Design an enzyme around this catalytic site. Structure first.
Site, PDB file in Angstrom:
ATOM      1  N   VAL A  70       0.844  -1.170   0.000  1.00  0.00           N
ATOM      2  CA  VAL A  70       0.000   0.000   0.000  1.00  0.00           C
ATOM      3  C   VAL A  70       0.894   1.239   0.000  1.00  0.00           C
ATOM      4  CG1 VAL A  70      -1.997   1.134   1.169  1.00  0.00           C
ATOM      5  CG2 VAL A  70      -1.576  -1.393   1.330  1.00  0.00           C
ATOM      6  N   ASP A  71       0.797   2.007  -1.079  1.00  0.00           N
ATOM      7  CA  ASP A  71       1.609   3.153  -1.335  1.00  0.00           C
ATOM      8  C   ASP A  71       0.735   4.287  -1.817  1.00  0.00           C
ATOM      9  OD1 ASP A  71       3.524   5.020  -2.097  1.00  0.00           O
ATOM     10  OD2 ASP A  71       3.968   4.072  -3.956  1.00  0.00           O
ATOM     11  N   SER A  72       0.527   5.269  -0.944  1.00  0.00           N
ATOM     12  CA  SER A  72      -0.221   6.470  -1.233  1.00  0.00           C
ATOM     13  C   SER A  72       0.521   7.470  -2.102  1.00  0.00           C
ATOM     14  CB  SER A  72      -0.618   7.177   0.062  1.00  0.00           C
ATOM     15  OG  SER A  72       0.464   7.953   0.512  1.00  0.00           O
ATOM     16  N   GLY A  73       1.780   7.182  -2.439  1.00  0.00           N
ATOM     17  CA  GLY A  73       2.551   8.040  -3.307  1.00  0.00           C
ATOM     18  C   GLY A  73       2.600   7.526  -4.712  1.00  0.00           C
ATOM     19  N   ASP A 133       3.436  10.273   1.680  1.00  0.00           N
ATOM     20  CA  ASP A 133       3.867   9.108   0.851  1.00  0.00           C
ATOM     21  C   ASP A 133       3.994   7.883   1.692  1.00  0.00           C
ATOM     22  OD1 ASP A 133       5.026   7.397  -1.016  1.00  0.00           O
ATOM     23  OD2 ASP A 133       6.716   8.763  -1.481  1.00  0.00           O
TER      24      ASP A 133
END
Lengths: 125, 130
Positions: free
Chosen positions: A20-23, B22
């Site tokens: 899980v990577d929000s970037g 991030d």
């Protein structure tokens, strides 16, 4: 050092440890895991062969929809498939927004609606 | 569609800065220009220059072990590396997301720390804040 965000889920009853990577703008699954799950001809080849992103990495195509199981919760999922991506699956900012997901690190889980999916321990690389 | 990436505003020593959130970045990192703009060079410990801990070709100017950052109207102690030419002023990595037990709430589009939610900046806010 801390453990990165990984969650367990089955994709056609094939367990995947999704990172899980929000970037990440896009959600992505590598070809090896795409092969293991059984989704290699659902691909909508529109970006294969001459992938315009000038890299070594070839884009196999685009799975428009396949169900993903997060601790019993079944979700429509969409993503790209790449040939030499080193990780099984990326949960991009797209899916993380579309399913209105919550990256919880005080309680340490990925919370979707009322379904909490704990993050994997360090003993699980 | 291409979604908006997640940024929050904050201040370090009175100076306004926007921070990228991030969850896939193991380290928090600030560019040289920002720390210079925030008056943080004197705080930069230069004992760890030239090391690389990340994936990329990573060459840091140093590490700031503690600087106060006013996030969600609270003073929050950050530690981050300083690297000269980074496109993004400040990256909130998984270290500080975890250190301060933050919540990245993409249902109501906010960053929750303690009892306070900072909303993610709208797309039309990103390329004008310095």
């Amino acid at each position: 050092k801390v453990t990165m965000l990984y969650v367990p889920c089955t994709i056609n009853q094939v367990l995947v440890k999704a990172f899980v990577d929000s970037g990440a703008q896009n959600s992505i699954m590598n070809k090896r895991t795409a092969e293991r799950c059984g989704l290699m001809r659902l691909v909508d080849v529109r970006m294969r062969g001459v992938a315009v992103g000038v890299g070594r990495q070839e884009i196999c195509g685009r799975i428009h929809m396949t169900p993903v199981n997060l601790a019993g919760m079944y979700i429509p999922f969409a993503f790209y498939v790449i040939e030499d991506q080193a990780m099984d699956l990326i949960i991009g900012l797209d899916q993380l927004k579309r399913h209105q997901m919550m990256i919880d690190l005080k309680h340490n889980c990925l919370t979707i609606d009322n379904i909490n999916v704990p993050f994997l321990p360090e003993n699980d690389l």
